[PDB]
Amino acid sequence: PSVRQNFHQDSEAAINRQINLELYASYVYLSMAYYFDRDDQALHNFAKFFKNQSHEEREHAEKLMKVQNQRGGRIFLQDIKKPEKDEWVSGVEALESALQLEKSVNQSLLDLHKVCSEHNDPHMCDFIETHYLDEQVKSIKELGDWVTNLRRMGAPQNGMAEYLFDKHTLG
Amino acid sequence: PSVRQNFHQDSEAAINRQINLELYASYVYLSMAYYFDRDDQALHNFAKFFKNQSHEEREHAEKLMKVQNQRGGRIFLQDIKKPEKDEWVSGVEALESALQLEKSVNQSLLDLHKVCSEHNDPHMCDFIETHYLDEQVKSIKELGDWVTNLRRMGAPQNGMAEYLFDKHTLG
Amino acid sequence: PSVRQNFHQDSEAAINRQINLELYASYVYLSMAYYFDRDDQALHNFAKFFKNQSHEEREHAEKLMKVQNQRGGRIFLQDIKKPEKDEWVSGVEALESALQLEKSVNQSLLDLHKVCSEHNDPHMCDFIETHYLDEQVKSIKELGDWVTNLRRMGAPQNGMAEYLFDKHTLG
Amino acid sequence: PSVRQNFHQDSEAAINRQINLELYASYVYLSMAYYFDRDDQALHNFAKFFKNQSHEEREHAEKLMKVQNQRGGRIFLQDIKKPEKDEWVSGVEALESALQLEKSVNQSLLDLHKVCSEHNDPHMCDFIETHYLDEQVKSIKELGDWVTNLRRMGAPQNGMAEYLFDKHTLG
Amino acid sequence: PSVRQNFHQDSEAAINRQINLELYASYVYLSMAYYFDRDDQALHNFAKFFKNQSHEEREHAEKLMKVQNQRGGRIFLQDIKKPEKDEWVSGVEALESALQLEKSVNQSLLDLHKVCSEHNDPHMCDFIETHYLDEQVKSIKELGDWVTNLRRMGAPQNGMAEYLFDKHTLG
Amino acid sequence: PSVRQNFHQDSEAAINRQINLELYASYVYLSMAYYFDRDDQALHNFAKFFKNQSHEEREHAEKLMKVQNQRGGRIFLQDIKKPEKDEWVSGVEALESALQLEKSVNQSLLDLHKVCSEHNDPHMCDFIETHYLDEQVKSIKELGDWVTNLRRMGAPQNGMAEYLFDKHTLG
Numbered sequence A, B, C, D, E, F: 001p002s003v004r005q006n007f008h009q010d011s012e013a014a015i016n017r018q019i020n021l022e023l024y025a026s027y028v029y030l031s032m033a034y035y036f037d038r039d040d041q042a043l044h045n046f047a048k049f050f051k052n053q054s055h056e057e058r059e060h061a062e063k064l065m066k067v068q069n070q071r072g073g074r075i076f077l078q079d080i081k082k083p084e085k086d087e088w089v090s091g092v093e094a095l096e097s098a099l100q101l102e103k104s105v106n107q108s109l110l111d112l113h114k115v116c117s118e119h120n121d122p123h124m125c126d127f128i129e130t131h132y133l134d135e136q137v138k139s140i141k142e143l144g145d146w147v148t149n150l151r152r153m154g155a156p157q158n159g160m161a162e163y164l165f166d167k168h169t170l171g
C-alpha cells in the first residue's frame, strides 16, 4: 500500500488478533446481557450494563479496524468464538467473569504495545495508550469496585443483594 | 419457565439458528464496511452504508434474543463464522454478495415462519411478519435497485461508475 | 536558559530541522494551490484544499517553534527552499507529489521521535505523538484514498475525472 | 488486589513519593500566597496567583492518589514538610524560588517516568505524559518569562517594578 | 506591624497552632477519602463526603491565615503530620474517627477562644464564634447522627448497612 | 494564456519579485514573533503583534499570486531567504528593524508601480494603489509612532519601558 510506512507485519498481525479479541469480548457481554434478561434472572440493570459494554467493545474493535486501514495493514477477520458459558450463574459471578475478561483483554493490549514498541512504532504505541490502556484500567477498577460491594453484601446467597445493587449502583 | 406457553422446542431451536444467522450477517457487513475503507478502495459512502447495515443486523439479532426470553426459550449462542471472503472485489460485487446474503437470511426467516406456523404459534408468526419479513423485502428490493444502476453504468470496469454512485445514491 | 531541563542539544537541533521542513511543506502546498488557480488549470477546489494545507503546515511549524522556546531551546531559521517543480502537471499528480511530501515529513518526525526517545525526553516524545504522528497518518491515508479514486477514474487522461472529483470530494 | 495488573512495587512506591512532593509543593505555594498577603508586602495578585497554584498542586496530588487506587496500589501518606522559608523576601525572589520548586517536581516526575518505563508500564508512562509533563513545562516557562520581566525592570530594588507587574501581568 | 493593635503574642501563637491543626484535619480527611476509593472498599459517596470535608478544613485553615495577617500577626507554618492510620477499617469506624477529630479541633478552638478572651480581644472572640464554633457543633452533631444510624443498622458486620447508607444518606 | 491582455513580461517579472519579498517579510516577522516568545525576552504582546504581521505579509503575497494568475502571468517562486538576524536584541530595536523592512518593501512596491506605469498597465497600477500603497504608508507611520514612544521612554536601557509599552500600546 502506498500509505504504509514504518508499519511492521508483526504489529499488523497483532492488531488483527486484538480485533478478534475485542469482538469476542463484545460477544461475551451480549451473552451476559440477555442472561440477566431471562425471566428466572430479571436483573434488568445488570442486563443494560452488559448490553452497553457489548456495544462499547464493538466500537473498540472497529477503531482497531480503522487504524489497521489507516496504516496500510490488511484486515483478516476470524470466527468470533462463542463464550465459555451459556449461563453466568449470578450477578456477582458474571461481574467476576467480566473482570477476568477485561484483564485478559488488557494483557493482550499490553502485549500489543510491546510489539509496536519493539518495532519503534510510536504512532501505534500512543494510539494504544490514548484509546485503550486507560479505558481498560478504568473498566477493571469499576468491576473490582462492584465485586467488592456485592460480596460484602453477601451476594449471591443474600437474595436482596443483587436486587438492591441493580437498583442503586446500576441505575 | 413459568412464562413458557404454547412455545415449541422446534420454534425455540429455530430462533437460536436465526439469532446466529443475523449475527453472521452483521459480521459480513462489518467486513464489507472496512473493505471499502481500505486506501486502495476508498468508497467511504459504500463503507458507511455497510457499517450501518452491520449495526442493523445486530439489532435484528438482539430482538430475536429478546423474544426468545419473552417466550421462555433459552438462548444458546454459537460461533459467529468469519465471512466467505476477505476482499469483496468491487462496490457492485459487494452489493451483489449482500443481495445473496439478504435472500439467504430471508429464506431462513420464511423457514422459521413455517416452523412456528406448523406448531400454531401465532404470536411468533406475527412477530416475524411485523419485524422481519417486510424489512427483508425492502432490503432486497433496494439492493436489487442499486445493482441494476451500477451494472447499467458499467461497474466495475467503468471507473467513474462506483465513484459517482457513492456520491449520489449513497450520500 | 533557566527553564532548560532534560533537553538535549540533539533534540534541539532536530526540532530546528523539523521547523524548516514544515515551512518547506507549507511552501510546496502554496505552490500547488496557485498552480490550480491558473486559468489553464482552474480546479479551484484542488486549489482551496492545497491552500488550506499550506496554512496548516505553517501552524505545524509554529507549534514546534513554540515548544523549542518552552523547553529553552533556541530557534535557528534557515532558507525555505523553493519547491522542486513550478508546475504540478495534473490534479492526481499533484496529490501523488503531496503524498510523497507527507511521507517524507512523517519519516522526519519519526526520526525526531527516535532522537528524543534516545535521550529519554518523554515530554518531547509525547508532544510529537500527540500533535504530529496521528495527524500525519490521517493526512497520508486521505491522500492515498484520493489518489486511488482519481486513478481508478482514469485521471489525468479522462478529462472528466478531476473536474468531477473537484466538485464531489473536494467540495 | 484483584485489579492489580502489570503494576510494579517500584512504580507504586514512586507514586507515593510523587504524591508527597505534590502536596509539599501545594504547601510551599500556600506559604507564598499568605506571605504577600502580609500588610508589609501587600501584592495581592502575587498572593492570588500563589494561592491558585497551591490548589492546583493539591489537584496534582489527588490525581496521583486516584491512579494509585485505579492500578491497585496502596496509598501511604507521609508528613507534609513545612517550606524551607517563612519569608520569601520579594515578588521576584518568590517566583525564582517557585521556579526551582517546579524544576525539582519536574525532575521527580521524569524519574517517575523512567521507573515506569523500565518496568514496561505504558499506562503509567502515558498518564504521566498526558497529565503532568506538559503542565510542568508550561509552568516552568511561565515562571521563567515572569522572572525575566521582573529582573529587567529592576525588581526588587525598583519599588515600582513588582507593584506594576502585580497590576499588569498578574491581573 | 503598623496594623497591629490589641493583639497579644499568646493569641498570635494560638492562631498558628490552630492553622496547623486545621491543615492536619484536612489531611486526615484526604486520607479517609481515598481509603474508600480503594477497590476493596469502594464506598464512593463516603469518599466524596470525606474529600469535601478535606477541602473545607483547608478553607478553615486559610481563614485563620487571613485573620493572622489582618491583625498583624505573623504566620509560622509547621509540618502537616501524617494521620494516625493508613487504613480506616470501615465506613462507620472512619466516621467515629472523624467525630473524635472534630471534637479535638473543637476543644482547640475553645482553648483558642479562652486565650483571646483572657487578653480581652473581642474581635478574635467573635471571629471564632462567627466562623468556627457553630460550624464545629453542626459537624459534630451530623457525625453523631450518622454513627447512630450506621451502628443501629449493624455496621460494619452487616454488609448491607454501609452500602445502603452510602446510597441514601451520602447521596 | 488566452486571458493575457496588456500584460508585459516586465510587469510579470516584477510581480514575481514582489511575491518573494512579501514572503520574505512574512518570514522576518515570524522570526521576530518567536524571538520575543523566548523565556529571556517574554514580551508576548510584541510577539503577538509580530505574529499577526507575519500572517498579513503572507496574505500580501497571496494576493499578488492571485493577480499574477488573473492577468495570465506565471508564478515562479524562489527560496525564502532566512532573516538577517537570529536575535533582534530588544523590542525597540526589532521595531526599528521592522521599519526598515517596511520601507524596503514600500520602495519595491513603488518600483513595481513605475514598471506597470511605464507599460501603461492601469489595472496593475490601481491594484497596487488600492491594495498595497496606503497599507504600507499606514504600517510605516505606525512603526514610526511606536519607535518614537519607546525611545522617548528610554528603551531599551529603561527596563520598564518595553514592559509597559507591551501592556499599554500592544494590548
Ligand SMILES: [Fe+3]
Binding pocket: A022, A025, A056, A057, A060, A105
Ligand atoms: Fe475492549
Ligand SMILES: [Fe+3]
Binding pocket: B022, B025, B056, B057, B060, B105
Ligand atoms: Fe437481518
Ligand SMILES: [Fe+3]
Binding pocket: C022, C025, C056, C057, C060, C105
Ligand atoms: Fe506538517
Ligand SMILES: [Fe+3]
Binding pocket: D022, D025, D056, D057, D060, D105
Ligand atoms: Fe504539581
Ligand SMILES: [Fe+3]
Binding pocket: E022, E025, E056, E057, E060, E105
Ligand atoms: Fe475545621
Ligand SMILES: [Fe+3]
Binding pocket: F022, F025, F056, F057, F060, F105
Ligand atoms: Fe507586505
